[PDB]
Amino acid sequence: ANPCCSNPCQNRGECMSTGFDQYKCDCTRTGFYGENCTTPEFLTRIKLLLKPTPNTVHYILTHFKGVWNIVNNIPFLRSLIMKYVLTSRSYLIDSPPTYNVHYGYKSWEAFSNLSYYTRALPPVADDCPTPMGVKGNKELPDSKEVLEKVLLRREFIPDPQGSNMMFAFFAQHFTHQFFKTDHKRGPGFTRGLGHGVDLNHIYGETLDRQHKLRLFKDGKLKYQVIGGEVYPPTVKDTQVEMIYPPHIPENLQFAVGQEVFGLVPGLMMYATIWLREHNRVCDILKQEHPEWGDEQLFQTSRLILIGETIKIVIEDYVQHLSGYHFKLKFDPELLFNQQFQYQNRIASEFNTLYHWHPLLPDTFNIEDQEYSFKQFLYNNSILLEHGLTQFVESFTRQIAGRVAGGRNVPIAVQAVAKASIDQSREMKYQSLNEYRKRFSLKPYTSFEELTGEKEMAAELKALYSDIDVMELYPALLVEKPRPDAIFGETMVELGAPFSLKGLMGNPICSPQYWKPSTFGGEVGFKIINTASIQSLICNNVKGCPFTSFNVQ
Amino acid sequence: ANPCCSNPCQNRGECMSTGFDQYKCDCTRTGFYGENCTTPEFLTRIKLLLKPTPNTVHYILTHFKGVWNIVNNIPFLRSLIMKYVLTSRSYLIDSPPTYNVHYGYKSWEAFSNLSYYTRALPPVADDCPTPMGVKGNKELPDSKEVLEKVLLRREFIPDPQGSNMMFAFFAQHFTHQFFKTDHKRGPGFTRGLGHGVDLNHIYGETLDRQHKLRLFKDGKLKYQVIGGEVYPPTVKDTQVEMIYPPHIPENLQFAVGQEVFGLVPGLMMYATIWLREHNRVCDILKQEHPEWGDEQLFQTSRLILIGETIKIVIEDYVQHLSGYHFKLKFDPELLFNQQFQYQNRIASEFNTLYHWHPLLPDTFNIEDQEYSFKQFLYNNSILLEHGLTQFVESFTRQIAGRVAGGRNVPIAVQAVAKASIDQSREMKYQSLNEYRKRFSLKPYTSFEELTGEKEMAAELKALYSDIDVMELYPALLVEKPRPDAIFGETMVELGAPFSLKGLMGNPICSPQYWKPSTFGGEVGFKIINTASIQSLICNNVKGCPFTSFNVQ
Ligand SMILES: *[C@@H]1O[C@H](CO)[C@@H](O[C@@H]2O[C@H](CO)[C@@H](O)[C@H](O)[C@H]2NC(C)=O)[C@H](O)[C@H]1NC(C)=O
Ligand SMILES: *[C@@H]1O[C@H](CO)[C@@H](O[C@@H]2O[C@H](CO)[C@@H](O)[C@H](O)[C@H]2NC(C)=O)[C@H](O)[C@H]1NC(C)=O
Ligand SMILES: CCCCCCCCO[C@@H]1O[C@H](CO)[C@@H](O)[C@H](O)[C@H]1O
Ligand SMILES: CCCCCCCCO[C@@H]1O[C@H](CO)[C@@H](O)[C@H](O)[C@H]1O
Ligand SMILES: *[C@@H]1O[C@H](CO)[C@@H](O)[C@H](O)[C@H]1NC(C)=O
Ligand SMILES: *[C@@H]1O[C@H](CO)[C@@H](O)[C@H](O)[C@H]1NC(C)=O
Ligand SMILES: *[C@@H]1O[C@H](CO)[C@@H](O)[C@H](O)[C@H]1NC(C)=O
Ligand SMILES: *[C@@H]1O[C@H](CO)[C@@H](O)[C@H](O)[C@H]1NC(C)=O
Numbered sequence A, B: 001a002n003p004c005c006s007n008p009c010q011n012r013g014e015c016m017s018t019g020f021d022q023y024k025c026d027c028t029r030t031g032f033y034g035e036n037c038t039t040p041e042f043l044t045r046i047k048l049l050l051k052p053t054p055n056t057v058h059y060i061l062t063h064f065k066g067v068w069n070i071v072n073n074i075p076f077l078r079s080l081i082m083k084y085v086l087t088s089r090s091y092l093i094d095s096p097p098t099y100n101v102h103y104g105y106k107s108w109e110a111f112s113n114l115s116y117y118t119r120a121l122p123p124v125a126d127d128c129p130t131p132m133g134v135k136g137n138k139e140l141p142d143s144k145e146v147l148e149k150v151l152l153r154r155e156f157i158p159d160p161q162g163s164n165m166m167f168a169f170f171a172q173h174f175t176h177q178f179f180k181t182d183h184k185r186g187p188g189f190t191r192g193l194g195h196g197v198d199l200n201h202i203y204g205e206t207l208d209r210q211h212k213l214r215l216f217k218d219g220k221l222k223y224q225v226i227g228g229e230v231y232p233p234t235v236k237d238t239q240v241e242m243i244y245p246p247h248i249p250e251n252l253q254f255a256v257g258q259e260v261f262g263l264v265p266g267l268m269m270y271a272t273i274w275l276r277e278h279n280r281v282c283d284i285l286k287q288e289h290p291e292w293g294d295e296q297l298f299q300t301s302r303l304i305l306i307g308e309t310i311k312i313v314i315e316d317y318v319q320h321l322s323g324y325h326f327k328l329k330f331d332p333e334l335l336f337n338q339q340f341q342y343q344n345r346i347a348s349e350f351n352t353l354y355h356w357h358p359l360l361p362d363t364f365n366i367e368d369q370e371y372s373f374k375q376f377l378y379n380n381s382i383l384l385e386h387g388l389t390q391f392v393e394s395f396t397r398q399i400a401g402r403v404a405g406g407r408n409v410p411i412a413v414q415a416v417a418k419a420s421i422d423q424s425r426e427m428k429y430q431s432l433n434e435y436r437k438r439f440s441l442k443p444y445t446s447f448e449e450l451t452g453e454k455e456m457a458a459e460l461k462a463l464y465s466d467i468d469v470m471e472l473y474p475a476l477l478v479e480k481p482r483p484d485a486i487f488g489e490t491m492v493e494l495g496a497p498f499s500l501k502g503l504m505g506n507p508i509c510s511p512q513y514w515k516p517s518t519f520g521g522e523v524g525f526k527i528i529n530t531a532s533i534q535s536l537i538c539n540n541v542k543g544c545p546f547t548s549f550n551v552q
Helices: A042-048 A054-062 A065-071 A075-090 A108-112 A143-151 A165-175 A207-212 A265-288 A294-322 A348-354 A380-386 A388-395 A414-426 A432-438 A447-451 A455-464 A472-478 A489-504 A522-529 A533-540 B042-048 B054-062 B065-071 B075-090 B108-112 B143-151 B165-175 B207-212 B265-288 B294-322 B348-354 B380-386 B388-395 B414-426 B432-438 B447-451 B455-464 B472-478 B489-504 B522-529 B533-540
Strands: A224-226 A229-231 B224-226 B229-231
Touching: A054 A489, A065 A075, A075 A489, A108 B294, A143 A414, A143 A455, A143 A472, A165 A265, A165 A294, A165 A388, A229 A265, A265 A294, A265 A380, A265 A388, A265 A522, A265 A533, A294 A489, A294 A522, A294 A533, A294 B108, A348 A414, A348 A472, A348 A489, A380 A388, A414 A472, A432 A472, A432 A489, A447 A455, A447 A472, A472 A489, B054 B489, B065 B075, B075 B489, B143 B414, B143 B455, B143 B472, B165 B265, B165 B294, B165 B388, B229 B265, B265 B294, B265 B380, B265 B388, B265 B522, B265 B533, B294 B489, B294 B522, B294 B533, B348 B414, B348 B472, B348 B489, B380 B388, B414 B472, B432 B472, B432 B489, B447 B455, B447 B472, B472 B489
Parallel strands: none
Antiparallel strands: A224 A229, B224 B229
């Protein structure tokens, strides 16, 4: 019965029920008047008649390599750009946070509760007629279908971008701090109240945990040496909470910031690395400050590491993920005169877009061997067996599956991807065209447009009928990739903002934090400013096995 | 042994232990180089040689009344000013938050833990030699002395500013949401994680509580009618948690957002008002949206009310408290192009400066009667007896005690004010000259300067010896008032920033919030934009008894 059901209000306008069967649009600071926030104002026009399509830009970003090389070696220029990129996004996210699962209108309970996941777009009134408000049928295509009909991988599709296993597990490992949905509660609730890059996966969310993972000496994290190698410590020695299957031997039950991380030798590997990184830093500090305390070292480290991370992600991970020729730079000093809200709340959407299963290979080739999901899972014995070094090298090449192309979802991952759809539905997610419009994206006029190819498209049009009624998550994996890219435009234009927020919006990136002091001074500062997934592995891993998020 | 103990680094510089008996200053974005962040840069100079003393300004603010009347009527002008005032402060606070009780260096644990109270200035290394770092003796003057020697009120001193009881109880009541120190934990910890104006005192901090205080109908708060009047409801009917003394009869045990508020008929009175305000709003909304739900009304109300509050404080309370001739305006639209961090963490300092006991009268004259603390305390029977209307009128006149003059602390309040000193000491608070310097205030060179008068001064100099070693809290109450003002410069220049933060930095003051929609549209929006302690009482209280925070 909700007169807003139809998502009438345009351009970030706000719909309000001005009576049982009537509504109203809050076209405030939107740039458009009219009952629907459509009629634009002048500057609006000129603003749009100077707004280049993302594809256009993306293009320019990935071409003229020669020129990009020029700028890539001209500090002010580079920054001037990187900044532009920074700022280009910025004005997109709703910070401070607004809606969430249960709240379609701004509410204190909303803005306050931290267990919720904020929503870039409001849900749909449970009173609304159709799942997408009004357009569509009493229901949505069964997921199993869609799942199969266009998602599940038939022939493994490699990511044209060269995304190796390293990248995959990173992204996997990394994103696992922010995204941490508490299911006991629901799909919409997170358990990572840190709502951002806080390496809680390395040090636990609660202090209690953190302390058990702490050695309380030189601010180092409790560790353990197996076969002359540094590894996370046992659950039987730290009593830390770790999610493991009955058979696992105590000598194998690893304890780390994240309780789930034991079920994936891929994850565990990274852990071990970072863990090693931390303590590595501790030593460097204890060198600088022979007069510091355990609790100070431990805390300075965590600050420096968080820095590195934010760096290695933006400058490596994200860099590669974009395939731009411009070298992405991480320097907060760029927002020091930019109206930027150094804060962040994690959105449901951003979580879903994450469901990057396609990356997942069909087997896991470590050195000679090749493993199956059925094999890999919870078999850290694997990790122990081959060693970090090999793992690195190995994973540094085993290309990962493309993700936007279509039907490239491992069958083992079956269950998951389905949920990914089922969920968004429960959370009354909005139409993909809505989320498209939201981020100022022209909506897809035909399934064929969304895919390019006519196969799936037609196959989908069968299922959804109205392009509008197309679900986001799905549309994302099926989306029509960019020229050899791994993602479509949609997935990029959504995570780009969402990301550079929690990335930049992190405390340490704020003025009264960005300084040597904050990190034990210059030395420990440099560390962050000179951090690459490369060195991260170089230092922490034996023999400095070369690596990249790119398979050569 | 801490080489930083001596607070060497100047101008917000950061000190770091560069070895056992050596340190270093992080003069970053400070404006000064030199080992101590002293040598200034050019623009710095020109910036200072254009920086008018607060006293100067304060003066200009409280004079030329004729001119102020001119501007007070030319919108752009007024705003242009108010804004200036807004922005003048801003660049002072450390948002996002930095140090706290246990942390003198920036730390995650710090920035993360919300039970802590942030600290505008770092504590002092427990390893430091003297309580104020180095200057001073192995200890500090016994508090009992100071307490008596210069704090306790002998002859009641009225605030020259006319601060009636209304103001007092408001300030009291209002500030009681942010400040809510959890003693079970310690002096440094707050229980109001809301860390700001969130009217948790009206709706409780936890949802559980809130729901019990909710009637779940038209989004109204559960209430009760006694003798034809609207009053908060009983603990025996809501099971809400309320702090009460054994004798109190259930029929008197009031349940309200704040558990402590029952022990002060002054507080309770305000509650009842606000409570009445809320439900009042609910009706106005239910009029606008006959199609809204209990939980939406309830939430919109709380949003509108929070607005009112932020208004009534800034525009009334704060206005009066300043005695400026310029009419202070509350309009977030002023920061919509200002690098302002719409967020807030409550500082310990700000909490202490609050300890405004001097305001407290010696008796409480309600109509004919006159009461004693021993009387008033936990005697809401009083409130019930006379009625809200009288209470208003009465309190609207009973002048409150000045606070900066000196020795004006009620003896009943004895215990408290002492604590106020004892505490800051535990929390290793810094020197008053430090906190002075901090907010770019020339430090007091002599106790006589801090007081003007020679009596107390001399009396103190006996106790502290070095002006520097003068404690803040004390120095505040004894401080030398402004020409007929109720506060000295120190207290003003500290709470000014601290305040306009949590005041402005509140969500609802942010761009994606400041709009009719957010509040059920224009109608419910206007409400906030047209709110005065006056109307607040006018609407909620019978007969619209005139009021002001000024006793005529
Ligand atoms: C605002 O948007 C609504 C739709 O969200 C428009 O209303 C529809 O207009 C068509 C064409 O006249 C009618 O056939 C429909 O019955 C209307 N309602 C709906 C729910 O579709 C409306 O015309 C728009 N107004 C403006 C000024 O843009
Ligand atoms: C920086 O500040 C320190 C004090 O915080 C200064 O050091 C003192 O200087 C005096 C005068 O030479 C000596 O008598 C003291 O022994 C020094 N130490 C202390 C703890 O007082 C120092 O001179 C300042 N340096 C600069 C460049 O400003
Ligand atoms: C001076 C440099 C001018 C660069 C103009 C670039 C215009 C790019 O144009 C883009 O090309 C894409 C193909 O890759 C299409 O998919 C997009 O729809 C189209 O807008
Ligand atoms: C064009 C307007 C010029 C105004 C000049 C104002 C100078 C105020 O000067 C101030 O006066 C106070 C007395 O009230 C003193 O206590 C302060 O120390 C003094 O700086
Ligand atoms: C957040 O909301 C959920 C459901 O509304 C509730 O169960 C939970 O206790 C809330 N969290 C907090 C911290 O209030
Ligand atoms: C686990 O790994 C070890 C060593 O690689 C191997 O011997 C064992 O068969 C594996 N078990 C499973 C269930 O994968
Ligand atoms: C905050 O810190 C105190 C002491 O460091 C600790 O007891 C408390 O549990 C912490 N709060 C949280 C939420 O971790
Ligand atoms: C409480 O108030 C009632 C009514 O004003 C009065 O009769 C009674 O004496 C008071 N008791 C105390 C302890 O103040």
